[PDB]
Amino acid sequence: RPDFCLEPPYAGACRARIIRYFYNAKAGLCQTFVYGGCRAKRNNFKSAEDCLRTCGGA
Q1: What residues form DSSP beta bridges with 20?
Q2: Whether 21 contacts 31, CB under 8 Å
Q3: Is 43 helix (H, G, I), strand (E, B) or coil?
Q4: Under a CB-based contact definition with an 8 Å cutoff, are residues 29 and 6 in contact?
């Protein structure tokens, strides 16, 4: 699995409330989180499908 998928979700410092997905590697699930709109890291997807396609293979 890609290393960036193992990183914790990153809201960042900005003040928007944008629902995004991250791969939760303990759960083995893509989950939602609130992204603030700046400085996104890579474990931050616009859909569950994109998250799972990227992060959701061994």
Answers
A1: 33
A2: yes
A3: coil
A4: no
Distance of CA 7 to the CA centre of its chain: 9
- What DSSP element (H or E) covers 30? strand 29-35
Instruction: Find out whether 20 and 48 touch, Cβ atoms under 8 Å.
Output: no
CA dihedral 35, 37, 39, 43 (to 10 degrees): 30
How many CB atoms sit inside 10 A of residue 5's CB? Answer: 19
Question: Residue 38 in contact with residue 12, Cβ under 8 Å?
Answer: yes
Domains and CATH numbers, the chain: 1-58 (4.10.410.10)
| Experiment type | X-ray
- Residue linked to tokens 């759960």: 27
- Give the experimental resolution in Å: 0.9
